[PDB]
Write a protein that binds this ligand. Structure first.
Ligand SMILES: Nc1cccc(-c2ccc(S(N)(=O)=O)cc2)c1
Ligand SMILES: Nc1cccc(-c2ccc(S(N)(=O)=O)cc2)c1
Ligand SMILES: [Zn+2]
Length: 257
């Protein structure tokens, strides 16, 4: 099926998912000089104190740290958003080399990786219903650069050997995603899509201006994961990013001057 190889990668997706060529596809390049400060945008409200992580899953495309989203426990509010969005999972996209890996770019700059914290609008009742709505999801995107280690990432890094291959999962309780955030919550925002099939146009993207730093050793461990299942030829899980898509009729707004 779809993936990130020569024969099933982003340039092929449109054949099964025609929305791939749609009017509000993600990711995009963030042209910092063209993005307009919007003084009406509110500070983001990230409320993760009551988060309940449950499990970590290798799904053959990335790994997901999954949360209990059966109550308002970890929520994103404010910013460009109307209402309350519940954290369901986070995952990353990363490269084979430090010079690539991010999905969004900033003045064409690629970062080593990009963290996506995925939230759904509670007015739609559950995640499956939310992805069918133009304002169904809010994804908080955070860039990763290689430098000093991120101590809050280490618990994630250390469990990866137990979920090496597609379909493997492991208990992953009491993980605090606040340890993955940068200091500043300054952001860019625009209407877009899921960045993998089914590529649904249901996402308010909120991309933080400040990257987090992770160590070379941390990202090297991401790169030891496998796209393949157990007992299949090893294909390293690297370069699981979609490149920038046309902005078309969209404006990127900045929360900051
Ligand atoms: N080589 C090969 C064999 C069988 C199926 C495929 C394949 C399957 C799905 C897609 S896609 N990206 O979903 O359109 C692209 C390629 C590719
Ligand atoms: N299979 C499936 C079903 C529903 C949603 C998704 C999904 C969710 C989030 C994202 S992303 N990478 O955060 O934009 C991409 C795809 C994937
Ligand atoms: Zn993602």
């Amino acid at each position: 099926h779809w993936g990130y190889g020569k024969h099933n990668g982003p340039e092929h997706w449109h054949k099964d998912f025609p929305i791939a060529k749609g009017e509000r596809q993600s990711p995009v390049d963030i042209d910092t000089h063209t993005a307009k400060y919007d003084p009406s945008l509110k500070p983001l409200s990230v409320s993760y104190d009551q988060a309940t992580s449950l499990r970590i899953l290798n799904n053959g495309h990335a790994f997901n740290v999954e949360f209990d989203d059966s109550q308002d426990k970890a929520v994103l509010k404010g910013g460009p958003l109307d209402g309350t969005y519940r954290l369901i999972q986070f995952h990353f996209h990363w490269g084979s080399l430090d010079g690539q890996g991010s999905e969004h770019t900033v003045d064409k700059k690629k970062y080593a990786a990009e963290l996506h914290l995925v939230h759904w609008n509670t007015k739609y009742g559950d995640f499956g219903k939310a992805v069918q709505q133009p304002d169904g999801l809010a994804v908080l995107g955070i860039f990763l650069k290689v430098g000093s280690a991120k101590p809050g990432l280490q618990k994630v890094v250390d469990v990866l050997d137990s979920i090496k291959t597609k379909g493997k999962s492991a208990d992953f309780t009491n993980f605090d995603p606040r340890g993955l955030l940068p200091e500043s919550l300054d952001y860019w925002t625009y209407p877009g899509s899921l960045t993998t099939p089914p590529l649904l146009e249901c996402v308010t993207w909120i991309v933080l201006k400040e990257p987090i730093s992770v160590s070379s050793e941390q990202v090297l461990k991401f790169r030891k994961l496998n796209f393949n299942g157990e007992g299949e030829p090893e294909e390293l899980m690297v370069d699981n990013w979609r490149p920038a898509q046309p902005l078309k009729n969209r404006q990127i707004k900045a929360s900051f001057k």
